[PDB]
Design a protein around this motif. Structure first.
Motif, PDB file in Angstrom:
ATOM      1  N   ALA A   1      31.065  35.268  47.100  1.00 47.87           N
ATOM      2  CA  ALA A   1      31.006  35.998  45.843  1.00 47.87           C
ATOM      3  C   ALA A   1      32.238  35.696  45.002  1.00 47.87           C
ATOM      4  N   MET A   2      32.012  35.275  43.762  1.00 46.38           N
ATOM      5  CA  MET A   2      33.116  35.006  42.859  1.00 46.38           C
ATOM      6  C   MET A   2      33.706  36.319  42.353  1.00 46.38           C
ATOM      7  N   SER A   3      34.842  36.210  41.663  1.00 44.09           N
ATOM      8  CA  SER A   3      35.483  37.399  41.112  1.00 44.09           C
ATOM      9  C   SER A   3      34.528  38.169  40.209  1.00 44.09           C
ATOM     10  N   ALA A   4      33.626  37.460  39.530  1.00 41.57           N
ATOM     11  CA  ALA A   4      32.675  38.067  38.608  1.00 41.57           C
ATOM     12  C   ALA A   4      31.227  37.899  39.054  1.00 41.57           C
ATOM     13  N   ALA A  55      30.421  40.408  42.191  1.00 41.63           N
ATOM     14  CA  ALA A  55      31.146  41.671  42.120  1.00 41.63           C
ATOM     15  C   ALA A  55      30.713  42.514  40.927  1.00 41.63           C
ATOM     16  N   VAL A  56      30.943  42.005  39.716  1.00 38.57           N
ATOM     17  CA  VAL A  56      30.673  42.804  38.526  1.00 38.57           C
ATOM     18  C   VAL A  56      29.182  43.087  38.406  1.00 38.57           C
ATOM     19  N   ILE A  57      28.344  42.064  38.583  1.00 35.92           N
ATOM     20  CA  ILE A  57      26.910  42.256  38.398  1.00 35.92           C
ATOM     21  C   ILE A  57      26.341  43.122  39.513  1.00 35.92           C
ATOM     22  N   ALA A  58      26.804  42.916  40.748  1.00 31.63           N
ATOM     23  CA  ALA A  58      26.316  43.740  41.849  1.00 31.63           C
ATOM     24  C   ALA A  58      26.653  45.207  41.621  1.00 31.63           C
ATOM     25  N   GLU A  59      27.917  45.508  41.315  1.00 34.30           N
ATOM     26  CA  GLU A  59      28.300  46.899  41.094  1.00 34.30           C
ATOM     27  C   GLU A  59      27.585  47.483  39.881  1.00 34.30           C
TER      28      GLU A  59
END
Lengths: 49, 49, 49, 300, 49, 49
Positions: free
Chosen positions: D216-219, D222-226
């Motif tokens: 998982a990349m930083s974005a 992470a961002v899309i999953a959350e």
DNA sequence: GTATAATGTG
């Protein structure tokens, strides 16, 4: 290299052999560990390619 | 959290090397060629690391 | 030449012919290695004539 | 340095053995083995003969030690020829010593054949087996190693005969190996590149430096999953409480394990057919309005 | 072969160092350093540190 | 053995163990025997005998 | 698992 030398030492001890070969392989394991911790600090460095 | 008053170094003893380790490496095999996954008690086994 | 002499010192002397003796792989390999990786074989910059 | 030279002195300390010496040592070792068999078989242990048997066992042990010490020279002279194949000469020498011990434990003197002939085959077999089983870091099966060696031998023979690198079709025709199998064997037979070799030749970085990850990349996640988890708490919560449990069980929000219509029916007592209508109604409800607008972004 | 025990290898060094007592040799070397012998004094000082 | 100690300059093992570097390297790589311990007390009490 | 023979390096 270190693992192979150690396993061979265990095999030789299990089977048993005259002390000359066992001592040679013990020297082998010692030199392998020496090479692991530092190459060129003593003796000829190891080179594959 | 982030309170590190001091940082010291020492000479590891047989017991210290074992205490840090979670498991013992018995065989030198690194990866299984067919499944492209770590082997039992190898240099990459999940059981160990 | 090293390999050629080694082969000829061992191969049968009766039905030996130079065709089966000369090995061409090392020479072409050396030429290709030089033309590929040698520091004196550089891309010809072509900004302008 | 010269780890080999100390071993050379050690091996050269002992002298050779002749045919009569070989025969007498074979007889002595046979007597010692038979004495040990008696020791483990002499239920009516004798008194003085027991001490004599122990002495004979020690004599046989000395005899076999001397035999192996004298025979190590043949092991060295055989392992000499397998150098430069990914294994240090010294490792091959140790493998040959193991093979020599294996040969000695099965030696027979009645046939009258010299021990060197019997030991050479075993030493060669042990050396080649060890090289096959240890030379490659990505250790291929022994049969595949044999196939690779056969393919390489055929390739070199064709190169010598034709004067040029044989094509895949020509190699397959000569060796009768499938082209796909030939490609598999050639790709499995290759020296790996050490991530620590310098790249660019200026030693400004080693290759291991420039290798990305595959997590998982930083974005990316992470961002899309959350964000889609929060939007789940917002949208999937809008579904009716009974429908919310239906999704949580049959589809697996809370407890996972998507409960097949039969399983969720067992939990709730409903049949497989009734739940389908409610599911389709939920689909129709979700696909229209703000819900679908929110969920479009996560479908692409 | 009844009084002195000798062996060759790292195991021998391990046994010898384990048997060797730092306090006794430290006291002896302190006493030696208490004397002069400048030629030997530098080596004695290094070993003492 | 750890390479850093018996090979470093100064060789810490040599200093602590009062051995010459040549002797240490000979012992480590199985070159010559060494007397680890001797029953000096029994040797003394039995000096007459 | 082996049967002519094969006994000290880069």
């Amino acid at each position: 290299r270190v693992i192979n030398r150690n396993n061979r030492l265990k095999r030789l001890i299990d089977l048993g052999a005259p002390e000359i070969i066992v001592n040679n392989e013990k020297r082998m394991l010692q030199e392998s560990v020496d090479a692991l911790f530092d190459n060129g600090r003593r003796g000829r460095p190891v080179t594959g390619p | 959290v982030n309170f590190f008053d001091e940082l010291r170094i020492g000479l590891a003893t047989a017991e210290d090397i074992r205490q840090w380790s979670y498991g013992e490496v018995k065989k030198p095999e690194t990866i299984n060629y067919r499944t492209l996954k770590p082997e039992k008690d190898g240099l990459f086994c999940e059981k160990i690391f | 030449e090293r390999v050629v002499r080694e082969r000829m010192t061992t191969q049968d002397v009766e039905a030996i012919t130079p065709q089966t003796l000369i090995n061409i792989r090392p020479v072409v390999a050396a030429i290709k290695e030089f033309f590929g990786t040698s520091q004196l074989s550089q891309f010809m910059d072509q900004n302008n004539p | 340095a010269d780890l080999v030279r100390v071993y050379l002195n050690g091996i050269g300390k002992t002298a050779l053995l002749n045919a009569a010496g070989e025969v007498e040592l074979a007889k002595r070792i046979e007597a010692g083995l038979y004495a040990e068999h008696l020791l483990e078989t002499r239920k009516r242990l004798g008194e003085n003969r027991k001490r004599d048997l122990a002495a004979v066992v020690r004599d046989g042990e000395a005899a076999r030690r001397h035999l192996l010490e004298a025979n190590l020279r043949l092991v060295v002279s055989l392992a000499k020829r397998y150098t430069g194949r990914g294994m240090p000469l010294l490792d091959l020498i140790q493998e040959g010593n193991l093979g020599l011990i294996r040969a000695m434990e099965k030696f027979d003197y009645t046939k009258g054949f010299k021990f060197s002939t019997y030991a050479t085959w075993w030493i060669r077999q042990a050396i080649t087996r060890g090289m096959a089983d240890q030379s490659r870091t990505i250790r291929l099966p022994v049969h595949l190693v044999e196939q690779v060696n056969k393919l390489a031998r055929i390739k070199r023979e064709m190169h010598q005969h034709l004067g040029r690198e044989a094509t895949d079709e020509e190699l397959a025709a000569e060796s009768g190996i499938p082209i796909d199998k030939i490609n598999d064997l050639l790709e499995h037979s290759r020296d790996p590149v050490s991530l620590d070799m310098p790249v660019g030749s200026e030693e400004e970085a080693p290759l291991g430096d420039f290798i990305e990850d595959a997590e998982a990349m930083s974005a990316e996640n992470a961002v899309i999953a959350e964000l889609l988890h929060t939007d789940i708490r917002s949208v999937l919560a809008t579904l009716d409480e009974r429908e919310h449990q239906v999704i949580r069980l049959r589809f697996g929000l809370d407890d996972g394990q998507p409960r097949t219509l039969d399983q969720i029916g067992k939990l709730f007592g409903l049949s497989r057919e009734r739940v389908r209508q409610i599911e389709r109604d939920v689909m129709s409800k979700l696909r229209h309005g703000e819900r679908a607008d929110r969920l479009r972004s996560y479908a692409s | 072969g009844e009084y002195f025990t000798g062996a060759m290898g790292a195991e021998s060094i391990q046994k010898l160092i384990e048997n060797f007592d730092i306090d006794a040799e430290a006291e002896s070397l302190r006493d030696v350093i208490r004397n002069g012998k400048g030629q030997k004094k530098l080596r004695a000082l290094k070993r003492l540190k | 053995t750890h390479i850093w100690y018996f090979k470093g300059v100064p060789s810490r093992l040599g200093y602590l163990l009062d051995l010459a570097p040549k002797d240490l390297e000979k012992i480590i790589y199985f070159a010559a025997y060494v007397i680890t311990s001797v029953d000096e007390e029994m040797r003394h009490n039995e000096l007459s005998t």
